[PDB]
């Protein structure tokens, strides 16, 4: 019962393949054993993806687990659709109806929009890049037109890293101009971190700002940077470490040696890697369900050339597809079930907020229930501005020998002393700079005076 399954790991993806191997070890069974053929490539390169796909195809794999990019995703969808080969991926969900593709990653749209509605954001800024596609952008624009939102859409992906210094300073300058504080970051974690560093550098992480990180990796990246900055940060978590399953898995994960499994010694795990693990589970359970239903998908002969025209798909493929889509299991991402098209169904996206002490879950998001909330949670010297007028505020004869509030005498001085006495605060008497009571200048439109 050797089951050949191809796989595609982008060069530089370690913890993903580590968790893949861990998944292979844990979900291994005496009945059948998966025999993966791993192929490392450049995920953004369409040619490379095509070649790897046809390589796996000619090898006669029954399924493929991999990743794609905004460039390569159409290659994968079209080829898997033509050759009836099932493709399982942690990478971003496709917008549309794509057959023979099983997308492990949940749709974040609902969670995000519901979060915006939760924080009651009428106007905000949306920072995106074209990596995972513009699907979310389209969504928030349509929802902005429907709910009467004023949204500032800015593409941070087209700015070159070599020349990007003043570009971002100008960006947040233009963003500070309108006084718009609320900001949403939809970006890859690298770009996110870069933007964050630029924010702390320009000091936009101070109080009054609210950042929304849209991704499932909210606690996967370093939050310590802006943690003490005093700005509110909110985000999404697909992996709950409070769950017993995840806790024990984490214990075994943390006990593993780093030499054999790269980057596998950690307290946490990137959500992509976890999705990979759960993907292994889904594949195992799928083929198990195929064997329990007494259906033999075994290949009679070699697949031949994928580019051979006209292409002919194998029959068994459809059966393997249905087998995968009908799977329902429990995993690190929570409840795992799929619809007819292969998108995730019935998930829970934990809604989390970064506080002083650290991150905490403020709620969860369901596809039906939308947002649901979890457990609800000296003296400064008062500056007194005043003007010199008789007998309201006057300078004492000896005033040069005194200092502070003792310098001034008058009705308003005594009144100030009384008010401070009843309200119980320390007060500092100061004379206004321009020496005016108050007015708005007709030209500058600026209020002057006390």
């Amino acid at each position: 019962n050797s089951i050949q399954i191809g796989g595609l790991f982008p060069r530089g993806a370690d913890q993903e393949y580590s968790a893949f191997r861990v998944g292979m070890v844990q979900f291994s069974t005496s009945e059948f054993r998966l025999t993966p053929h791993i192929d490392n490539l450049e995920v953004a390169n369409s040619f490379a993806v095509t070649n790897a796909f046809c390589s796996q195809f000619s090898r006669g794999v029954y399924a493929i687990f991999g990743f794609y990019d905004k460039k390569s995703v159409n290659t994968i969808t079209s080829f898997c659709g033509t050759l009836h080969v099932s493709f399982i991926t942690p990478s971003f969900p496709t917008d549309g109806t794509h057959p023979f593709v099983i997308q492990m990653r949940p749709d974040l749209k609902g969670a995000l929009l519901s979060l915006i509605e939760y924080y009651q954001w009428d106007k905000f800024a949306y920072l995106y890049d074209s990596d995972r596609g513009l699907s979310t952008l389209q969504a928030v624009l349509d929802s902005a037109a429907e709910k009467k939102w004023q949204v500032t859409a800015i593409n941070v992906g087209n700015i070159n890293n070599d020349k990007k210094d003043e570009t971002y300073r100008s960006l947040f300058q233009d963003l500070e101009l309108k006084g718009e504080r609320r900001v949403i970051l939809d970006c890859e974690r690298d770009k996110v971190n870069d933007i964050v560093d630029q924010v702390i550098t320009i000091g936009k992480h101070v109080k009054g700002y609210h950042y929304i990180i849209a991704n499932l990796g909210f606690t996967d990246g370093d939050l310590l940077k802006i943690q003490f900055g005093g700005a509110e940060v909110s985000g999404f978590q697909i992996v709950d470490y409070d769950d017993s399953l995840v806790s024990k898995f984490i214990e075994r994960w943390s006990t593993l040696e780093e030499k054999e499994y790269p980057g596998a010694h950690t307290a946490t795990i990137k959500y992509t890697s976890a999705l990979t693990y759960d993907a292994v589970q889904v594949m195992t359970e799928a083929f198990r369900n195929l064997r329990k239903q007494r259906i033999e998908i075994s290949r009679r002969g070699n697949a031949g050339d994928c580019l051979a025209n006209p292409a002919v798909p194998w029959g068994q493929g459809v059966e393997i597809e249905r087998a995968l889509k009908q799977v329902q299991v429990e995993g690190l991402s929570g409840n795992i079930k799929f619809d007819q098209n292969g998108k995730r169904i019935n998930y829970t996206i934990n809604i989390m907020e970064l506080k002083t002490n650290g991150p905490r879950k403020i709620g969860y998001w369901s596809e039906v229930d939308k947002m649901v909330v979890t457990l609800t949670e000296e003296q400064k010297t008062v500056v007194v501005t005043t003007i010199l007028e008789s007998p309201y505020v006057m300078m004492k004869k000896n005033h040069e020998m005194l200092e502070g509030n003792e310098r001034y005498e008058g009705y308003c001085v005594d009144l100030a002393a009384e008010i401070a006495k009843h309200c119980g605060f320390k007060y500092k008497l100061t004379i206004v700079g321009d020496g005016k009571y108050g007015a708005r200048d007709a030209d500058t439109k600026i209020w002057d005076g006390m």
Binding site: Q120, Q150, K178, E180, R181, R440
Partner: protein
């Protein structure tokens, strides 16, 4: 040049709203300030009254923090009343 009424109103509401947008989340506090800015920019027949008085009142009493957009959308059609006294 020439002064209008309707033009003054349509200007008034827009300038108030656009003003309140910078003050988002403190919005219920700054209604009158922004109304001052709108009355200055759009002009007024009686400086005390302002460009549109009824819209100002409607906003002041209705507007709650972050509820701005819906509030303005409800208040912008409101009768300005007499721009004399």
């Amino acid at each position: 040049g020439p002064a209008d009424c309707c033009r003054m109103k349509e200007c008034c509401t827009d300038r108030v709203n656009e003003c309140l947008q910078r003050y988002s989340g403190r919005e219920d506090k700054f209604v009158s300030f922004c109304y001052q800015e709108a009355t200055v920019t759009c002009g007024s027949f009686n400086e005390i009254v302002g460009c549109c008085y009824g819209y100002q009142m409607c906003m002041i009493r209705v507007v709650k923090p972050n509820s701005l957009s819906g509030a303005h959308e409800a208040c912008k059609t409101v009768s300005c009343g007499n721009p004399c006294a």
